[PDB]
């Protein structure tokens, strides 16, 4: 398949070929053009706060060690010994000043440097160039209010610029709330879906909630429950959708601060967010203060998703075209009382974790849609993402990005897939920019 010319995503992101969820050659190509090119979630400050603390994380199919340095910075390295390539670290988290290889005993520091080699003098004499034998380092590591991302490409735009217009929406909760913490360890489960299936679902899919989650809505009695079984749709002005140049996007459901939480937490949360909102009105304005306590369903391109307020934080780690390893953390506001932090974290897992009853509702949808992408008669078929097309705007006076002023639509799918075409058909970051020079015009076309 010639990725320079193949139309995998139509103009304006209106449709995508179903094969993108099943083609293994394309998956291999995404390793290069998506995962080795873009910003990927690694960890949070709250998980590695002290010097020597480390965690392992995936970046695409690669595994890296993410380590807090003595100077307070964070560096990340491939979890692969420079000698004969054994995996260096076999645990998920810890504290150490270095890592020693269990094969021949080479010892690397938390800074990636080759520090010791068994019997170096008797064996290598002075012939070993240790300075050129440090662990392979992740070129770029940057923080968005404690959330640490990595990128293998030195040509990538800075993380803040990469978030583009989505950043404005995240800032009330990520910055002005006083800060978030990630509660680990994450749940980890393998699903038989392509990584794009959950990514697209979280980036822009409010349409599925009432039907897919009818049973969960009915049973949990959460605030969004009026939608169970499409018994009712919300108010035209119940929310909005947005997308951005580099692919990130989100849905906004006004005021839904308790999110997917069952009625047992709704009162405490609605009180907490409302009180903080009242203070934020004076600091960032009424609109941004309301955004703080509004439910955002977001995907940070390519494979990091979250539900603010609900506090669900996901990484869709690719394994192959029909396999993904799902990591689920909870996000909590740092100044929430400890007991509320604990209950919210359990509720995140209760709804969206390994035994999450809401997440279970989505399984078959993601898995079968992905697997059908392999089936002969569906490969060349078109997945549709035209809902709301030609009503999106950009450069709005209040809400930035390409924006659909409706709660339910497919604006965010269109922006995600537009960014995806541009990457798959480009050899580098300069070519992606050239392919994206009229990104918002392409997305708003007929309006």
């Amino acid at each position: 398949m010639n990725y320079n010319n193949k139309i995998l995503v139509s103009e304006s992101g209106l449709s995508q070929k179903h094969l993108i969820h099943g083609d293994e050659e394309l998956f291999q190509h995404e390793l290069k053009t998506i995962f080795a090119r873009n910003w990927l979630f690694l960890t949070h400050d709250s998980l590695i706060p002290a010097p020597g603390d480390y965690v392992t994380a995936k970046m695409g199919i690669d595994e890296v060690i993410v380590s807090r340095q003595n100077d307070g910075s964070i560096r990340a390295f491939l979890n692969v010994c420079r000698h004969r390539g054994k995996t260096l670290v076999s645990v998920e988290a810890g504290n150490a000043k270095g890592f020693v290889c269990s094969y021949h005993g080479w010892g690397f520091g938390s800074n990636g440097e080759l520090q010791s080699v068994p019997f170096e003098k008797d064996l290598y004499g002075e012939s070993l160039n240790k300075k050129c034998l440090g662990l392979k380092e992740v070129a770029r590591v940057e923080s968005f209010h404690g959330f640490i991302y990595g990128c293998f490409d030195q040509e990538a735009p800075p993380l803040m610029d990469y978030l583009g217009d989505a950043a404005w929406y995240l800032e009330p909760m990520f910055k002005h709330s006083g800060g978030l913490e990630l509660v680990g360890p994450p749940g980890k489960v393998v699903i038989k879906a392509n990584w794009k299936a959950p990514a697209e679902n979280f980036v822009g899919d409010a349409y599925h909630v009432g039907w897919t989650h009818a049973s969960s809505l009915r049973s949990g009695e959460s605030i969004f429950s009026s939608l169970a079984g499409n018994a009712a749709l919300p108010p035209e002005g119940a929310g909005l959708q947005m997308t951005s140049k580099y692919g990130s996007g989100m849905g906004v459901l006004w005021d839904g601060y308790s999110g997917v939480h069952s009625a047992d937490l709704v009162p405490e949360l609605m009180a907490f967010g409302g009180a903080k909102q009242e203070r934020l009105n004076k600091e960032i304005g009424d609109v941004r203060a309301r955004i703080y306590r509004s439910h955002l369903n977001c995907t940070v391109f390519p494979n990091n998703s979250m539900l603010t307020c609900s506090g669900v934080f996901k990484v869709w780690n690719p394994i192959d075209a029909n396999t993904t390893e799902v990591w689920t953390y909870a996000i909590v506001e740092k100044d929430m009382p400890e007991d509320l932090k604990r209950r919210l974290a359990d509720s995140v897992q209760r709804t969206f974790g390994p035994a999450g009853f809401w997440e279970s509702d989505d399984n078959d949808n993601m898995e079968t849609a992905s697997q059908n992408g392999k089936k002969y008669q569906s490969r060349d078929s078109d997945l549709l993402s035209n809902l709301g097309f030609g009503e999106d705007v950009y450069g709005d006076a209040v809400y930035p990005g390409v924006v659909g002023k409706s709660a339910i639509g497919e604006t965010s799918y269109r922006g995600f897939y537009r960014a995806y075409q541009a990457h798959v058909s480009s050899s580098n970051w300069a070519e992606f920019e050239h392919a994206s020079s009229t990104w918002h015009t392409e997305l708003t076309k007929t309006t």
Binding site: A93, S219, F357
Partner: protein, 193 residues
Amino acid sequence: MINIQEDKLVSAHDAEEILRFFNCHDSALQQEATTLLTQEAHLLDIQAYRAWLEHCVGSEVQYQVISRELRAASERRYKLNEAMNVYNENFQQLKVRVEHQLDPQNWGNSPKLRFTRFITNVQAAMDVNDKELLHIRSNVILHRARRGNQVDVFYAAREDKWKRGEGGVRKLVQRFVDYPERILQTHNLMVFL
């Protein structure tokens, strides 16, 4: 019995549980516990979830299944949350899960799932302090089969506390499972262990 300074791989928690069962053996209690667990598993296997709640689960129940993060056996400095709760349910939370299972719009339950449970290695010991309470340990293999060719098998050890109840109806007041697989390869863990 065990000395964890010598038996270096054994946790203090695990050593306490062995002590509990090796001491006084009450053959009749073992058999009663075996029957109780077999009946509970039968109710679950036929998806009689409301009956399970009514006949087997106490109002004060804590139903907990954890996933522990992989850490170095020699770790001793890193002190942040060691596990996470796949389940950590009170009675009302179990009831929500049961209602979800029985809702006719739970699309994932059509066609009907098939469950088969295998309970083994049953041990039972009375609580030293609370005479209403019985400690029961058992291991479970749980087989789920759905949608023609989906098959998921779960394996675990269960540390339970059951109360005598009224009328001979013993009820679960605590179930604790430390799930042995860190990364699940069963699509989800939406089963009652």
